[PDB]
């Protein structure tokens, strides 16, 4: 039966026009399709349908910068003036014996301003300490691009054991956030003068420090 | 105006039967040139159509799933339901319901309204409800005039967990972070709210955590204080 072939990735700059491609299988070059958009953590949104001759009809509420076109077996989604909220996965869809989807194309939108991370570091709560555990919580927010490395220190010695760190993902404000957690015993926490979370982003570093003598 | 919402369990064991229900608002599962459809998306992967059906009993299935799936439509409640028999880890996915529209103007079939999706984890692992701990900032972190208060939602399985503050009345300055998946196979996340360092004693902060697979539903009071709780007695600077 019919198959839809989409390349899995595309990337382009804010303000440009972008063209995404869906290819129909052999023998199905006359087929019409629909385009759907899926923003991160959301359900898909129907964008438009599109004939093999390139006539498109947008869904209700879809901006007019989304259009479609066609050439032979290829079907196009054209985004005229790329916006940050267009960063999303785009799926073509058709029908035959049943309903059919392409594999999706993840569109990365480029060009936003660089931004250094903000770092918040929390000491363990008394409640967790009473439960005979200790977790330091380092929260990293509002940075772009999305690559950081996190290093922990006990006083001035590097700490590698007990460290768990997320892969950065974009938040509602279109900037990356990440978290790092250091698991200690309460004895380790009270045994040192301080602990530090150090975040390196684009060659530059930001450090926060907490100490058991700061809390009581 | 058409809206769809999925409900179902968050965690099921291998070989069980999964049941999901879609509830439709602003339209009727009894009237129109529509089919009512299910689609799923394993984490990090693409959309896969499952099946659809109509109140009239017409149904259509993904061949690879046809023998495992049953679809029902309930006009009395404006709902429709999917059942998937003998699940394995291959069935872990976000499941979406959708309205499949037949467009008479074109002859085309396309999903024009989608639900938000519900995560279903298929695993032999047990559920695990989180511990919820208040996050109190150091006094130095607060000395700039604003401070972060938070809740640590520690050691749970599976995803997801919902967090709100003051039952949803407090939204400005709230940031809930993505969870970390630890080496143990358990998740942790943190949620914080930025507040003025000023009075704060005149303020109530309750983090509402809900982990539905473990029925862990907790409202944790977070004291508007730094991690040095004795400062208003001793008056020391830390
Ligand atoms: O995998 S999908 O294209 O959505 C469904 C087809 O029956 C295969």
Residue numbers in the entry:
A (entry chain L): 2 to 217
B (entry chain H): 1 to 238
Q: Which text from the study accompanies this structure?
A:
In comparison, the refined model of 32D6-Fab in the trigonal crystal shows much larger conformational difference from those of 3.3-Fab and 2B5-Fab, with RMSD of 2.28 Å – 2.48 Å for 356–366 matched pairs of Cα atoms. The other is bound to the central cavity of 32D6-Fab, far away from the CDRs. The PEG molecule interacts with the first Fab mainly via van der Waals contacts with at least five heavy-chain residues and two light-chain residues. The residues that are in contact with the bound PEG include Q41(H), V94(H), F96(H), G117(H) and L119(H) from the VH domain, E159(H) and P160(H) from the CH1 domain, and Q39(L), R40(L), P41(L), G42(L), K43(L) and D90(L) from the VL domain.
Polyethylene glycol (PEG) is a water-soluble, low immunogenic and biocompatible polymer formed by repeating units of ethylene glycol. In this study, we determined the crystal structures of two PEG-specific Fab and one nonspecific Fab in complex with PEG.
